[PDB]
Each structure stands twice: as structure tokens, then as C-alpha cells.
Amino acid sequence: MRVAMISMHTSPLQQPGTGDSGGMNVYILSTATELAKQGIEVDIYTRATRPSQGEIVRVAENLRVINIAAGPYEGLSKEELPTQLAAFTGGMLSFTRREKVTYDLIHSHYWLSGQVGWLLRDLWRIPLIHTAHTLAAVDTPESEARRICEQQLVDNADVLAVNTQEEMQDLMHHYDADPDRISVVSPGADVELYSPGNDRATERSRRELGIPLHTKVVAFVGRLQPFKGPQVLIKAVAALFDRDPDRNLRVIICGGPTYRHMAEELGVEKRIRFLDPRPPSELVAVYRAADIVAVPSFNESFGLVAMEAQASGTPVIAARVGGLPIAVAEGETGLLVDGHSPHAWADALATLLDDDETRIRMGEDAVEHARTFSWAATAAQLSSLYNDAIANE
Amino acid sequence: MRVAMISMHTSPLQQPGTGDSGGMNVYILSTATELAKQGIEVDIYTRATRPSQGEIVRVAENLRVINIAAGPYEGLSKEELPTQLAAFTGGMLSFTRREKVTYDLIHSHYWLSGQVGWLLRDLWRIPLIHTAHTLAAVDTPESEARRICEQQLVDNADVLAVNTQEEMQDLMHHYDADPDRISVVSPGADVELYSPGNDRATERSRRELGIPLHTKVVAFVGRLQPFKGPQVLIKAVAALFDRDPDRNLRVIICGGPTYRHMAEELGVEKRIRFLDPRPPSELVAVYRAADIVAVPSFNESFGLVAMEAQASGTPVIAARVGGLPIAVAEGETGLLVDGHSPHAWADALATLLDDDETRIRMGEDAVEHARTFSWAATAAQLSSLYNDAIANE
Numbered sequence: 035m036r037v038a039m040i041s042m043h044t045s046p047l048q049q050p051g052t053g054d055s056g057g058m059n060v061y062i063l064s065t066a067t068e069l070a071k072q073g074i075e076v077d078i079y080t081r082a083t084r085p086s087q088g089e090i091v092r093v094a095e096n097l098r099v100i101n102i103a104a105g106p107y108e109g110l111s112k113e114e115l116p117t118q119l120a121a122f123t124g125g126m127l128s129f130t131r132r133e134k135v136t137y138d139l140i141h142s143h144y145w146l147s148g149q150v151g152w153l154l155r156d157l158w159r160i161p162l163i164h165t166a167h168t169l170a171a172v173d174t175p176e177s178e179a180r181r182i183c184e185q186q187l188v189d190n191a192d193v194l195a196v197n198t199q200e201e202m203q204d205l206m207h208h209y210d211a212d213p214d215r216i217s218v219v220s221p222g223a224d225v226e227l228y229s230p231g232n233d234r235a236t237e238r239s240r241r242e243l244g245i246p247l248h249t250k251v252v253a254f255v256g257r258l259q260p261f262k263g264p265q266v267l268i269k270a271v272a273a274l275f276d277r278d279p280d281r282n283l284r285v286i287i288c289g290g291p292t293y294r295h296m297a298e299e300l301g302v303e304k305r306i307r308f309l310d311p312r313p314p315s316e317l318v319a320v321y322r323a324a325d326i327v328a329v330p331s332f333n334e335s336f337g338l339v340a341m342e343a344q345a346s347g348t349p350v351i352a353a354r355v356g357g358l359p360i361a362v363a364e365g366e367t368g369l370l371v372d373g374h375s376p377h378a379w380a381d382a383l384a385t386l387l388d389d390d391e392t393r394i395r396m397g398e399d400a401v402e403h404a405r406t407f408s409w410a411a412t413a414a415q416l417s418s419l420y421n422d423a424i425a426n427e
Numbered sequence: 428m429r430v431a432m433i434s435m436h437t438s439p440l441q442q443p444g445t446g447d448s449g450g451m452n453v454y455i456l457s458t459a460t461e462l463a464k465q466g467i468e469v470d471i472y473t474r475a476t477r478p479s480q481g482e483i484v485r486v487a488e489n490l491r492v493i494n495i496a497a498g499p500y501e502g503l504s505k506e507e508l509p510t511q512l513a514a515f516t517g518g519m520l521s522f523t524r525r526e527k528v529t530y531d532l533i534h535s536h537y538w539l540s541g542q543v544g545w546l547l548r549d550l551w552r553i554p555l556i557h558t559a560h561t562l563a564a565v566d567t568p569e570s571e572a573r574r575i576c577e578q579q580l581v582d583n584a585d586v587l588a589v590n591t592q593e594e595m596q597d598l599m600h601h602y603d604a605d606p607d608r609i610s611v612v613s614p615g616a617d618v619e620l621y622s623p624g625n626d627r628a629t630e631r632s633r634r635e636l637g638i639p640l641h642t643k644v645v646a647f648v649g650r651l652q653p654f655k656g657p658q659v660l661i662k663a664v665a666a667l668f669d670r671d672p673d674r675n676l677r678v679i680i681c682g683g684p685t686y687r688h689m690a691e692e693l694g695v696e697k698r699i700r701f702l703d704p705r706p707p708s709e710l711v712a713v714y715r716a717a718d719i720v721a722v723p724s725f726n727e728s729f730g731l732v733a734m735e736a737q738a739s740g741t742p743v744i745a746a747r748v749g750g751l752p753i754a755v756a757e758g759e760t761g762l763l764v765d766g767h768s769p770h771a772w773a774d775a776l777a778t779l780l781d782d783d784e785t786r787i788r789m790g791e792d793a794v795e796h797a798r799t800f801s802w803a804a805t806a807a808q809l810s811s812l813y814n815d816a817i818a819n820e
């Protein structure tokens with residue numbers, strides 16, 4: 035079995051997040067790697083952006099990323115990438131023709147990639163598996179255009195792979211999806227890498243990151259886009275410092291795009307610290323060093339940062355939003371905040387910072403919790419999904 | 428020979444202009460009709476927007492328009508149509524597969540249509556002929572995206588068909604076009620329909636349109652978009668009425684999208700009159716009834732209204748812009764204004780309104796002039812263009 039995965043607008047090889055690179059990228063790369071271990075051949079197609087990488091990147095046995103040239107290597111933001119839909123498809127058509135390579139099935143990620151895959155599937159007479167990841171309908175002409183396309187994929191993909199059950203409800207409610215085509219594939223997290231793990235480990239991480247050993251630490255991890263709520267953490271942190279101006283707290287925010295600006299405006303620059311985005315082998319230390327990981331997302335999806343925080347033995351305080359309620363066992367492995375007000379987040383941060391015994395236990399419980407996912411697990415579900423799709427064509 | 432013409436975002440069957448329908452539409456339909464008379468089979472592919480029309484419209488022997496479903500029949504403005512690039516292509520792929528129809532060559536119109544045709548041409552192993560019509564580079568992310576695509580077509584089409592020589596210079600200067608691929612196909616105008624034509628004809632047209640027989644008439648014809656300059660005519664007309672408040676002048680503006688609003692604000696509503704867009708058999712009367720046709724375009728292309736005005740024996744006052752200097756023999760068949768100031772246009776309008784002998788002669792000379800184009804003529808050039816392209820594949 036050879037699968038073509040399509041990831042048009044962002045490459046699995048991009049440092050997540052910064053950029054347009056986040057959970058979706060690591061979802062695609064992690065599932066792909068596990069599929070490849072299981073004997074399944076995966077080619078992940080993405081738009082070429084870094085010519086030093088070459089056309090074909092051999093990632094591991096059975097795993098390749100294909101950088102397809104379509105428009106300049108730069109000066110094209112996500113919003114304009116629709117203009118490259120036909121060219122990127124054509125890119126894949128040449129590549130496959132040139133390399134004489136045939137696929138059993140296509141698995142597209144995000145609506146741009148799906149539009150590509152819908153054309154390819156009729157042409158190649160193979161099935162399309164589509165994963166939305168995020169949806170317009172969950173108010174501009176550009177979003178109505180995107181919705182309309184998301185609507186097309188819903189009506190045409192052979193299988194709609196969603197990441198949670200709540201996402202399946204969304205497909206059914208907002209997109210009139212036929213439930214017989216939706217299929218829940220519950221995601222994973224690299225649970226061997228992200229891990230507590232050793233009794234000296236937190237304080238080793240702290241030495242390594244230059245954090246003082248005796249202080250409480252809250253961490254934000256991920257893209258510094260406003261829908262991710264880092265502003266909420268900074269605002270909440272400021273609130274805590276009005277209540278008690280010498281609270282023993284430091285914040286590390288990690289990593290990529292100003293918020294430092296908001297933090298000076300609010301008088302808290304000295305206790306906040308912005309870490310550059312880094313690869314997973316190095317993010318572990320951020321998680322380990324943190325007492326609490328705050329994930330104040332406005333939109334979401336399926337909660338990957340929450341999962342890795344948990345895996346690594348650190349309780350999470352998340353927004354009641356997207357996948358987070360499922361990624362976090364409210365009251366057992368962390369807290370869920372309603373809304374994004376600074377007052378509410380200060381309260382929730384205060385209750386875990388001041389109650390040592392509770393927080394220490396949430397952390398331990400989270401490890402057991404996070405072990406319910408499992409990229410391997412995720413691949414095994416996709417494995418079956420694929421087999422069925424092929425079986426039924 | 429079967430040619431597939433691609434016209435994604437606007438259909439040759441749409442009333443020009445209103446809408447997104449103008450010279451390009453009538454260019455595509457007129458060339459197509461003449462190609463069909465000459466024994467060449469044309470299928471013009473367009474996005475389906477009016478379901479009462481059905482999938483295939485038999486226009487005349489060898490001529491069909493194909494309405495391809497791709498996104499809603501409405502709520503999708505031109506700016507969003509990139510999101511339907513892959514779907515519209517896929518639409519054409521199904522249709523051709525379903526109908527078992529094969530093409531010798533593709534001729535695409537406008538950058539959206541070309542992106543579609545570029546993919547189709549590699550897939551079908553046939554040549555692509557591309558006609559830009561208008562170009563971004565002749566300042567937003569959306570226009571930079573469009574330019575970038577226009578740049579792709581320049582680099583990839585087998586033949587770049589331009590409408591004038593000045594357009595070829597643009598391809599070479601702004602798009603680094605290789606001159607060996609550019610080919611000038613000079614356009615036409617329906618010169619039997621648009622025509623003076625009979626000594627009672629102007630005053631017959633006037634009775635028909637309800638215009639007073641003894642008054643000077645200026646006409647604007649075409650889309651009421653701001654780049655078309657109707658505001659310039661209205662502003663200029665107002666200027667004339669400051670100079671001489673009982674000048675014997677009436678204006679007819681025809682036709683589709685406020686300007687009436689601008690005309691009241693300026694005190695001239697009573698001498699201006701907005702005609703609904705109408706089909707060519709009925710536009711003749713507007714041209715015939717006019718003493719002068721004002722074409723204050725800001726952008727352009729290749730000057731179709733100017734040509735039909737001329738054909739119908741009416742002198743033109745045009746902006747020194749796009750094709751207009753070639754469509755109009757400055758000083759022989761009308762005037763060319765530099766810039767779009769009201770003062771300049773009043774001057775130019777005043778010199779032709781007050782000098783009866785000159786204007787009457789320009790009109791007669793214009794008839795002889797307009798006979799240099801010739802949709803038949805245009806088709807014959809495309810005929811050869813096609814044969815060469817096929818011959819050289």
C-alpha cells in the first residue's frame with residue numbers, strides 16, 4: 035500500500051509553531067512515521083518553500099516528503115495560496131508521471147489539500163480520506179469561500195476523518211455531513227519523548243533552561259497567534275501580580291510569531307521569558323520545567339500541546355474549547371476555564387499554584403492519562419480506515 | 428479540430444457589462460462563432476451560474492458553451508473564485524470523461540482560466556494558447572498573487588496571444604516574456620451590426636430611445652465600474668454646464684453596475700439618463716443616437732466599445748490608455764485625452780460638440796476606420812495560430 039498524503043500549505047518538516055506550523059504538522063509527520071513502520075508507504079506532498087531541501091526528502095524507510103514547486107518559495111501567505119491550487123495539483127501530476135509512481139489511496143489534510151485530493155482521486159480512480167483539522171464554520175468573503183470548499187469536501191470525500199467525536203458533531207451540524215462517512219481517529223502524542231521522567235528531571239531541565247530552582251513556573255507552548263491566547267496568559271499573570279506583587283512565579287512562553295511589548299505595558303516583562311521555538315527533543319525540558327502549562331486557546335482542535343504537557347507529567351489549565359475537554363480530565367489532571375477573562379484565569383492559576391498537594395497529584399495522574407494516546411494507535415486506526423476504503427471502491 | 432476554450436469566471440452568454448461581463452466575453456463569443464463557421468469545433472467552458480441553462484448549451488453548429496458546476500451558483504465574487512480552481516478543473520475532467528470528448532488544443536482566457544488550462548494541457552498532452560486580456564502588473568497581496576500566476580502562464584503557455592503590440596511590450600517588460608511565444612491577434616468588432624447606417628437612422632434611433640431630435644448627445648457604454656471612468660464623464664458634463672448652463676446637451680449612460688447619486692450631487696441629473704444594459708441588436712441604437720461616445724477608461728485593453736462606436740459612425744473621445752490609441756485614429760476619427768481631469772474632458776467634449784463640420788467628418792471617417800477589424804479576420808488569425816501550435820507539438 036502506497037498512500038499519498040497531501041499537506042499543501044505547510045510542510046511536515048517545518049519547525050512547529052512558529053509559522054503556519056503546529057499540531058497539524060506534527061499530526062501528519064507522526065502518523066506518517068508510524069504508518070511507515072507498519073510497512074505502509076507514505077509520500078507526503080507539500081509546496082516547496084526551502085529549495086536547499088531538494089525535491090524528494092527521504093525521511094525514513096517507506097517515508098518521503100515531496101516538495102512540489104508551485105509559485106515562489108516565498109511571498110505567498112496562506113490566504114493567497116488558493117491561487118496555487120491548480121499549479122500545485124499539476125506539480126503533483128508531473129512528479130507522479132515523471133517518477134512513474136502509483137497510489138492506492140489519498141489522505142488530504144486541511145481544505146486546500148483536500149480540494150487538491152478531490153481532483154486527484156477522480157483522476158486516479160482511488161479513494162480520498164480527508165481530515166479538516168479546523169473549519170471555517172466553527173465572517174468575511176474569504177471564510178465563506180473556505181466554508182463552501184469545506185462543504186464540498188464533506189459531500190465528496192470517501193471518508194471524513196475527524197479527531198474527536200465533538201468534531202464529528204460539527205461536521206454533522208454545520209456541514210450536513212452524512213454520518214456514515216465520518217470516522218473518528220483519535221490522535222496521539224509522543225509519549226516516550228514527552229515524559230516526567232526521573233526524580234531529578236524537573237530540576238535538571240531548570241538548570242538547562244536557566245530557570246531558578248525554587249519558583250513556580252507556568253509555560254505557554256505553541257504559535258504566538260492571538261487565537262492561541264498567549265495574551266490571556268500575560269493578562270492573567272499581570273492580574274496575579276496586582277493581587278500579590280511578590281508572588282513567587284515565573285512564566286516561560288515558547289515559541290514563535292510584540293507580546294514582549296504587551297508584557298512591558300503591563301509591568302511584567304521581568305517575570306516573563308520568551309523562548310525560541312525548538313524541536314521536540316528540546317521542548318521536553320520546557321514541559322518538565324513547568325509546574326503548570328496554560329493553554330488559553332480560542333480555537334482548537336484536538337489539543338496536542340495539552341497532551342504533551344500531560345505526558346510529561348505537568349498539569350494543564352485549558353480553555354473549554356475544541357478538543358481540550360477531552361485532552362484534559364477536568365478536575366483530575368488539570369482545570370478547564372470558561373471564557374478568556376484575566377480574572378478567571380488568575381483564579382484558576384492561583385488555585386493550582388497555591389495548592390501544592392493537588393497540583394503534584396494532578397501531574398502524576400496526567401501521566402497515566404496521557405498514555406491513552408499513542409501515535410501508534412493512531413496509525414493502526416488509519417491503517418484500518420485505509421483498508422476499508424480500498425476494500426469498498 | 429476541437430478546441431476547448433476556457434472562460435472560468437464569466438460566461439460568454441452573460442449580458443455584457445453589467446456584472447463581470449464585458450469586452451472579454453464578447454471577444455470570446457465572437458471569435459468562437461467565427462471559428463465555428465470556419466469548420467472548427469469550439470467548446471467554451473465556464474463556471475455554472477444559471478442552472479436553468481443546463482449543462483451543455485448548443486449555441487450554433489460546432490459551437491457549445493459548457494456550464495461546469497463548481498461551488499454555489501451564487502455568493503462567490505471574482506476575488507474568491509481562486510478557491511474553486513481545483514474544483515472547476517475537476518468539473519471539466521468529469522465532463523470530458525463522461526462525454527468521451529477529446530481536444531486538439533486549449534485556449535484559455537484570463538489568469539484564472541489559464542491556471543486551469545496549464546494543468547489540463549500537461550494532462551492531455553496538448554498545447555495551451557493563453558490570452559491574459561488584462562494584467563495585474565499593468566498593490567495588495569491579492570494582486571501580487573495574481574501577478575505571480577500571470578507570470579506562471581507567461582513562462583508555460585505554448586502561445587501567448589495578445590490583442591495589440593503594446594500588450595506584447597507589456598508581456599516583455601513586466602513579465603519577462605520570451606518574444607518567440609507572443610503572437611499578436613488583432614481583435615474585431617461586429618461591424619455589420621454596429622453601423623451608421625441609412626440617412627434617417629440616427630433620428631430613428633432617437634425616436635426609439637425617446638431622445639429629443641435636436642440636441643447633442645454624448646454616450647457612455649459599458650460596465651459602471653470606477654476604472655471605466657463614467658464618473659469622469661459626469662464630472663466633465665457638470666463642468667460644461669458651469670461654463671454654459673443652457674448648453675444643448677444630453678447624456679445617455681448604458682448600462683450596468685449611485686452614479687445617478689453623483690449626478691444629483693452635481694446638479695445634472697435632469698440632463699443625464701441611465702439606460703439598462705441591453706443586447707447588441709439594441710445597443711446599436713445607443714451608438715447611432717450619440718453624436719460622440721466618451722470612453723474615459725482608466726484601464727484597458729484593447730478598446731471594444733471604441734471600435735463599435737466607430738463602426739456605427741460615431742466619433743470617440745477616449746483616454747490615452749490601453750488599446751484606445753490604436754482603436755482610435757487620433758485627430759481623424761476622434762480625440763484622445765491625457766489624464767482624467769474634468770477640465771481636460773470638458774475641453775475635448777466642447778471642441779467636438781461646437782465644431783459640427785469636424786465631428787460630422789470624424790464620424791464618417793470612423794466607419795472606414797472600423798472596417799479594419801473584423802472578427803473574421805480575428806478567427807483566421809487564431810485558426811493559423813492553432814494550426815502552428817498543433818504542427819509543433
Ligand SMILES: O=c1ccn([C@@H]2O[C@H](COP(=O)(O)OP(=O)(O)O)[C@@H](O)[C@H]2O)c(=O)[nH]1
Nearest residue numbers: 050051056057058060256289311312338339
Ligand atoms: O517550540 C515549540 C513549540 C511548539 N511545538 C509543537 O507545536 C505543536 C503546537 O500544537 P498546538 O495544538 O497547541 O498548535 P495548534 O495545533 O493549535 O496549531 C505541538 O505539537 C508542539 O509539540 C514545537 O514543536 N516546538
Ligand SMILES: O=c1ccn([C@@H]2O[C@H](COP(=O)(O)OP(=O)(O)O)[C@@H](O)[C@H]2O)c(=O)[nH]1
Nearest residue numbers: 443444449450451453649682704705731732
Ligand atoms: O448595454 C450594453 C453595454 C455594453 N455592451 C458591451 O459591453 C462590452 C464592453 O466593452 P468594454 O471594452 O468597454 O468593457 P471592457 O472590455 O473594458 O471590459 C462591449 O462589447 C459592448 O458591446 C453590451 O453588450 N450591452
Ligand SMILES: [Mg+2]
Nearest residue numbers: 321322324348
Ligand atoms: Mg513539569
Ligand SMILES: [Mg+2]
Nearest residue numbers: 714715717741
Ligand atoms: Mg452616432
